[PDB]
Amino acid sequence: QGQIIHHRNFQSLYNNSWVCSLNVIKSRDGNNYSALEQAFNNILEGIDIIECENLLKEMNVQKIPESSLFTNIKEALQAEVFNSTVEDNFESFISYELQNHGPLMLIRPSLGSECLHAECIVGYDSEVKKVLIYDSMNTSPEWQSNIDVYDKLTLAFNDKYKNEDCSICGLYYDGVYEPKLEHHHH
């Protein structure tokens, strides 16, 4: 024949991405999450994303609460609309969430819907209309355009891309997070 095929188990690291994302949102000040020291932290024979919901709760990670801005963004996401008005609302939404709730973890379908994928929104600058993304399937943190992040949100929030195991999909935060109120002299 000239056909040689070995039969071996495959593991995707997509399933490990929720653990990385959990560390991002639970950690502070460039350290790791202090309660790290279970299958939880295993590469092989660990906990798949689809199974992680109870563990997220136990780490005081919760879905972001309902709000007018969030309702408005979801409506635009469902309608597949992007314009200056949607972008203004997106900026206001991401800014409020980052300020008040801290870094967000997004759990979403992979493009093509094979696997779930977790990544984090860690920062925003209105000066350049870019979002700081920590996606552990990349080699490093990346600043991405608003439209590129909007496309990621579309997979999590537009009904075209959702099914039953997608109840876990959405935006999460560290329930322990409190903003630090800075004072300036001038």
Q: What is the resolution of this structure in A?
A: 1.7
Closest CA to 153 of 102, 94, 100: 94
What are 173's two structure tokens? 């935060």
- Per-position b or e across 106-122, b if 16+ CB within 10 A of its CB: bbbbeeeeeebbbbbbb
Eight-state DSSP code of residue 107: E
Torsion, Cα of 106, 20, 135, 137 (10° steps): -120
Query: For residues 154, 87, 96 and 14, what is the CA-based torsion angle, rounded to 10 degrees?
Result: 30
